[PDB]
């Protein structure tokens, strides 16, 4: 399977999540996710095929984690926009008020800007720190997701947000979305990851 920030995948046959973004950890290829996406050693699925098992994670708290793939599989420094793509061109991390979209197999590519760092969630399983809120919308399904800005610059992956009873918060204004993303960097060197770039 093509390896491409934005698309979904299965977990276990049962949950989906979308992919964050490309990444190698030496000769091994992965994509770094949400951590409450699977369990370490969870089957990731694209398309119905095996790609890889989840290798690490941390939910709650943090929520990151990255699957290692089989090596059949291609990653490419890419972002899915619909029908065309972002390229990946590194990781800086963008400041408040800088314009950010995300990408995921529930709302497609959305976009809005970066309204706060250092957010906790409070969800069912625990409290997770630390996560920078951004008003672009989404939905159940785009979690694990890449956030990148139009540059290029890889953001983090999608945790949580206020979704309404449609399953989304694209139905109310940005002004009452909270959207949170878990930052890319701490994943990238907590587990010695290098990203795809191009």
């Known amino acids: ?28 290829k992965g994509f770094v996710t949400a951590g409450h996406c699977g369990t370490v050693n969870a089957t990731a699925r694209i398309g119905g095929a095996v790609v890889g098992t989840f290798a690490a994670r941390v939910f ?4 990151r984690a990255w699957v290692s793939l089989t090596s059949a599989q291609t990653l490419l420094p890419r972002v899915a926009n619909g029908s065309s793509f972002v390229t990946v061109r590194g990781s800086t991390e963008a400041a408040v008020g800088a314009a950010v979209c995300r990408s995921g197999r529930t709302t497609g590519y ?41 540059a290029g610059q890889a953001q983090g992956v999608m945790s949580g947000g206020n979704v309404q009873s449609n399953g989304n918060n694209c139905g109310i204004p940005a002004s009452q979305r909270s959207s949170l993303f878990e930052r890319l ?9 290098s990203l795809v770039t191009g």
């Open 110 to 150: 959305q976009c809005g800007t970066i309204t706060a760092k250092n957010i906790t969630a409070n969800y069912a399983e625990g409290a997770v720190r630390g996560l920078t809120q951004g008003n672009a919308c989404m939905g159940r399904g785009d979690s694990g997701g890449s956030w990148i800005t139009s």
């Open 60 to 63: 709650p708290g943090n929520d």
């Open 1 to 28: 399977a093509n390896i491409v920030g934005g698309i979904e995948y299965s977990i276990n046959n049962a949950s989906l999540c979308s992919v964050g973004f490309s990444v190698t950890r030496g000769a091994t």
């Open 185 to 193: 960097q701490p994943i990238l060197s907590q587990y010695g990851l």
